[PDB]
C-alpha cells in the first residue's frame, strides 16, 4: 500500500509498505530513500508518536494515509 511521509521542509515522500511492517522497518525505508538516520526520525500519526516495535496495523494506518516526520537533532 502507498503511504505519504510529510517532512517539515514541505517535501512529501511516498513509500510502499504493508500494514504488517514495523515502525523500525518504515524508518529504514526512509533512510534508504532520503538518507535520514533512523535515530533522528520521529514519526507522528493521528497525534501519536509511533514506536519502533509496533506495526502500522497496530495504529490502524490505512492506504494513502500521511505520517508526519519531525527530525530530532542538536546540530545542522
Amino acid at each position: 500500500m502507498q503511504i505519504f511521509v510529510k517532512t517539515l521542509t514541505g517535501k512529501t515522500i511516498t513509500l510502499e509498505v504493508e500494514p504488517s511492517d514495523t515502525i523500525e522497518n518504515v524508518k529504514a525505508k526512509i533512510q534508504d530513500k532520503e538518507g535520514i538516520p533512523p535515530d533522528q526520525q520521529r514519526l507522528i500519526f493521528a497525534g501519536k508518536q509511533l514506536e519502533d516495535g509496533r506495526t502500522l496495523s497496530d495504529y490502524n494506518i490505512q492506504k494513502e494515509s500521511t505520517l508526519h516526520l519531525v527530525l530530532r537533532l542538536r546540530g545542522g
Binding site: 517539515l8 507522528i44 497525534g47 519531525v70
Partner: protein, 49 residues
Amino acid sequence: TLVTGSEYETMLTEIMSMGYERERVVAALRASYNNPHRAVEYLLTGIPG
C-alpha cells in the same frame, strides 16, 4: 523575503496541522524566538511559564 507576521502564522499553520493550535505554537514562537520547527520542538518539551 517575507514579513515577520506572515511567516509567523505560517509557522502556526504548519506546526498546526501537527496537532498544535496557532496559539500553542505561536506562544511556542515567543518561546522559540519566532522559529517554527523549534516552536514545535517546544510544543514537545512542554509549555512552561
